């Protein structure tokens, strides 16, 4: 409910991947790329590998990552949380892995909630770029390789 008056991400709080509670206002002054991700997903290892990619090259820019696990989309991510983190790192995952979250209808998690109505998530590995302030400055599609934001990031850093 109160989700709907926010007007940043770093109003929200999540939980990682290993059950810390995470104030999402320590990502103030950093751009964020938030994604929601899938281990069993036809995409899975394209979005991987370029996030991956994109967190070596640019972590000292500024970049942050964050990904929430979502089985909402063809049941493609079955597992639990600790087969989610042992699976993002064979891929060498060294950015912010959260809890499994709904992203879509009333269960959605707050923030996802929030992204949305900024001026449903189709599929696995949709992507929002958010700035130092927190806000929502741009989305990219599940069919939008991560390697399609880079040119975006430096206006934001």
């Known amino acids: 409910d109160?989700?709907?008056?926010?007007?940043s991400m770093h109003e929200f709080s999540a939980k990682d991947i290993d059950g810390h509670?995470?104030?999402?206002?320590?990502?103030?002054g950093f751009?964020?790329?938030?994604?929601?991700?899938?281990s069993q997903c036809g995409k899975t290892e394209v979005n991987y590998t370029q996030l991956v990619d994109l967190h070596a090259r640019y972590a000292e820019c500024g970049l942050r990552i964050l990904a929430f696990p979502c089985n909402q989309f063809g049941k493609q991510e079955p597992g639990?949380?600790?087969?989610?983190?042992?699976?993002?790192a064979?891929?060498?995952?060294?950015?912010?892995?959260?809890?499994?979250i709904c992203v879509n209808g009333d269960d959605a998690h707050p923030l996802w909630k929030w992204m949305?109505?900024?001026?449903?998530?189709?599929?696995?590995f949709t992507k929002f770029l958010?700035?130092?302030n927190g806000c929502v400055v741009k989305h990219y599609g599940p069919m939008e390789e991560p390697l399609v934001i880079e040119?975006?990031?430096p206006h934001y850093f």
């Not at 109160?2 to 007007?7: L, T, V, Y």
């Not at 509670?21 to 103030?28: G, Q």
């Not at 751009?31 to 899938?38: D, F, K, S």
């Open 90 to 100: 064979g891929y060498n995952v060294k950015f912010d892995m959260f809890s499994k």
């Open 80 to 88: 639990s949380n600790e087969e989610i983190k042992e699976f993002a």
């Open 31 to 38: 751009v964020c790329i938030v994604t929601n991700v899938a």
């Open 151 to 153: 040119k975006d990031l």
């Open 116 to 124: 949305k109505i900024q001026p449903a998530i189709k599929w696995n």
């Open 2 to 7: 109160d989700w709907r008056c926010a007007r």
């Open 130 to 132: 958010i700035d130092k």
């Open 21 to 28: 509670m995470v104030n999402l206002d320590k990502y103030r």
